[PDB]
């Protein structure tokens, strides 16, 4: 039977969530909390509070994933709550601006930190990083198109690599702290900025760093026991990332003072140059391996999202096809890789993250209020675990705070993002809303011929 063959264990889910949550943010820039907090102890407080507020949302997606039990991770939940229109808007904006830009940016940072010991303070060449990024994207696309177990093995290996590197940084900081100095942690909370506009921006920066706890909800139909292995893996992977994020900043503040932290391009590179005499290239190599681990999880999640969106009536049905042996969604992965390679061609794509700062948390909060509305409207659905209504309410308030910040400040880019997200409405009312045997025949014949040729090339049929 040609179906999608559920092969994801508990360890694979833990490695997926940890390898998507820990990325380049803990390595190259844990600076926003310190620049808006102006103290060490208040920065550690803001890091712990951001970890708690991300646990509160991860529990809500554990309940949503065990209740609805369909892949897509907000697309399926908005379909189950307010179906049709808003789900298509979310699918359109993630197809158009969110996932190609993030995948291209992760690939570019991988390529930039692969060549950093050759170009220490040098302004590394531009065209050599785009080629390495394209090679990285094409290699991970091939690996995920071959087998699913190959992608889970890659995720396991590079998650172990980044965790071992962060453990090395933590152990060096702890042995220098307890050894003979302990100097910066004597007069903490001095010079602290106890204002609303500073604590709010520090919490915003700390809460962007915990992003990515919803990766396993995109692949829910491929987990062995989804009523057990999804919330157990979420509850395993949350305190690991929280403890690692606190202890890495403690190790950063033990060795470095505030001035050279706030005036460095990457804090971990300065840490490695100051505490490791030789073998200071280990840390940029580890940053490159961390970005290689994150790109694989992003590719798998985006391909499964586009698969489900194709199956639900949007996004024409070639993207729903499955390979007849080696049961992998090949044309979905091909479409995702093509879009990421197209977005690599645009110089200064780091501007483009300012356009979906508003939309991402808007759709997370929309899925949380959909969970609340389904708790009110359908109270007799089979829920294998239901929590209190405390967590969805406090995460609804947290997401309202998360979307209020890019609307007040940085207000021109948010309206551009809303225009980008609303730019798919000519496709919804003129193609999707109208049924078949009323659409133009010359479009249908062309799409059918292209689907048949792509089906013969990729050896892929729809699910039986």
Partner 1 sequence: KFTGLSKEELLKVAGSPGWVRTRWALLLLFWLGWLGMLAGAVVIIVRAPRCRELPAQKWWHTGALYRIGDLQAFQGHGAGNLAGLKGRLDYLSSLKVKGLVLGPIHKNQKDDVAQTDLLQIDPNFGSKEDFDSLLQSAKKKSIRVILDLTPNYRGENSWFSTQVDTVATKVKDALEFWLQAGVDGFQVRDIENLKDASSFLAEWQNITKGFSEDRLLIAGTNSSDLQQILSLLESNKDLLLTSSYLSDSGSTGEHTKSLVTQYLNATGNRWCSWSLSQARLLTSFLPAQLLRLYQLMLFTLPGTPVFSYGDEIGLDAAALPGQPMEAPVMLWDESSFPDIPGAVSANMTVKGQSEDPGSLLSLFRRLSDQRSKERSLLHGDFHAFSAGPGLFSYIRHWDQNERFLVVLNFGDVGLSAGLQASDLPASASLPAKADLLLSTQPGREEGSPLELERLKLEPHEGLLLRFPYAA
Ligand X SMILES: NC(=[NH2+])NCCC[C@H](N)C(=O)O
Using CB under 6 A as the criterion, which residues of the chain lie in contact with ligand X when the complex forms? 20-21, 23-26, 209, 211-212
**Max intra-chain CA distance, the chain:** 79
Strands, E, within 352-398: which ranges?
none
Shortest spacing between CB 119 and partner 1, in angstroms: 7
Q: Which does 212 bind (CB under 5 to 8 A by kind): ligand X, partner 1, none?
A: ligand X
Stretch that binds partner 1, among 122-130, 195-203, 248-256, 406-414 (CB under 8 A): 122-130
Residue 387 interacts with partner 1 (CB under 8 A)?
no
Pairing of strands 460-461, 322-323: antiparallel
Q: Does 438 bind partner 1 (CB under 8 A)?
A: no
318's contact among ligand X, partner 1, none, with CB below 5 to 8 A by partner kind, is: partner 1
DSSP-derived letter for residue 444 is H
**Which residue intervals of 116-147 are DSSP H helices?**
126-146
Q: Contact letters (x/-) for partner 1, 81-120, by CB under 8 A?
A: ----------------------------------x--xxx
Q: Whole-angstrom distance between the N-terminal and C-terminal Cα of the chain? A: 6
Asked if 321 touches partner 1 (CB under 8 A), the answer is yes
445 binds partner 1 (CB under 8 A): yes
Is 461 one of the binding residues for partner 1 (CB under 8 A)?
yes
Instruction: CB nearer to ligand X: give 61 or 327.
Output: 61
> Rounded distance, CA 95 to CA 34, Å?
34
3 sits near partner 1 (criterion: CB under 8 A)? no
Regarding 127 and contact with partner 1 (CB under 8 A), the answer is yes
Among candidate residues 53, 42, 343, the one with its CA nearest the CA of residue 208: 53
Contact assessment for residue 157 and residue 356, using Cβ atoms and an 8 Å cutoff: no
Evaluate the CA torsion angle 313, 315, 316, 320 in order and state its sign: negative
Q: How far apart are CA 199 and CA 192, in angstroms?
A: 10
Q: Smallest distance, Å, CB 297 to ligand X? A: 8
Structure tokens at 166: 């962060």
Q: Is 412 in the site for partner 1 (CB under 8 A)?
A: no
Other C-beta atoms lying within 10 Å of the C-beta of residue 419: 10
**In angstroms, what is the minimal distance from the CB of 23 to ligand X?**
2
**Number of residues lying near partner 1 (CB under 8 A):** 39
Cα within 13 Å of Cα(297), Cβ side: 29
Give the separation between CA 405 and CA 413, rounded to whole angstroms. 12
Q: Which of 5, 52, 138, 182 binds partner 1 (CB under 8 A)?
A: 138
Span near partner 1 by CB under 8 A; candidates 95-103, 126-134, 173-181, 207-215: 126-134
Least gap, CB of 257 to partner 1 (angstroms)? 7
């Amino acid at each position: 039977q040609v179906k999608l063959k559920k092969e994801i264990s508990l360890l694979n889910g833990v490695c997926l969530i940890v390898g998507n949550m820990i990325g380049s943010g803990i390595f190259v820039s844990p600076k926003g909390v310190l620049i808006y907090s102006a103290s060490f102890g208040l920065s550690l407080v803001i890091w712990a509070v951001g970890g708690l507020f991300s646990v509160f949302g991860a529990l809500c997606y554990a309940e949503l994933g065990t209740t609805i039990k369909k892949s897509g991770a907000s697309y399926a939940y908005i379909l189950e709550a307010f179906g049709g229109f808003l789900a298509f808007i979310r699918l359109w904006t993630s197809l158009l601006i969110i996932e190609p830009t993030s995948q291209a940016i992760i690939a570019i940072t991988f390529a930039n930190y692969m060549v950093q010991p050759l170009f220490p303070s040098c302004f590394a060449p531009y065209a050599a990083s785009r080629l390495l990024a394209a090679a990285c994207i094409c290699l991970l696309t091939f690996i995920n198109c071959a087998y699913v177990k190959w992608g889970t093995l890659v995720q396991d290996i590079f998650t172990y690599a980044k965790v071992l590197a962060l453990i090395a940084v933590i152990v060096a900081g702890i042995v220098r702290l307890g050894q003979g100095a302990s100097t910066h942690f004597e007069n903490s909370f001095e010079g602290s900025s106890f204002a609303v506009g500073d604590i709010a921006l520090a919490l915003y920066s700390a809460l962007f760093s915990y992003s990515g706890w919803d990766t396993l909800n995109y692949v829910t139909e491929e987990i062995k026991n989804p009523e057990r292995n999804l919330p157990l893996s979420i509850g395993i992977s949350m305190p690991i990332v929280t403890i690692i994020y606190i202890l890495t900043n403690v190790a950063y503040y033990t060795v470095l003072d505030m001035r050279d932290i706030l005036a460095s391009d990457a804090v971990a590179v300065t840490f490695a140059d100051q505490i490791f005499g030789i073998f200071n290239w280990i840390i940029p190599l580890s940053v490159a391996l961390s970005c290689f681990g994150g790109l694989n999880a992003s590719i798998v999640a985006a391909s499964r999202l586009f698969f489900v969106g194709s199956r639900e009536g949007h996004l024409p049905d070639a993207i729903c096809m499955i390979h007849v042996e080696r049961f992998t969604p090949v044309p979905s992965l091909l479409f995702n890789g093509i879009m990421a390679l197209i977005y690599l061609c645009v110089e200064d794509i780091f501007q483009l993250i300012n356009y979906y700062s508003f939309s991402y948390w808007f759709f997370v909060g929309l899925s949380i209020v959909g969970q609340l509305y389904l708790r009110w409207k359908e109270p007799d659905r089979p829920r294998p675990l239901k929590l209190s209504v405390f967590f969805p309410i406090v995460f609804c308030l947290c997401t309202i705070f998360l979307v209020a910040v890019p609307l007040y400040s940085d207000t021109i880019n948010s309206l551009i993002g809303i225009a980008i997200a609303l730019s798919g409405l000519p496709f919804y009312f003129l193609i999707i809303r109208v049924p078949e045997h009323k659409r133009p025949l010359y479009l249908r014949r062309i799409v059918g011929s292209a689907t048949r040729y792509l089906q013969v090339l990729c050896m892929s049929v729809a699910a039986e």
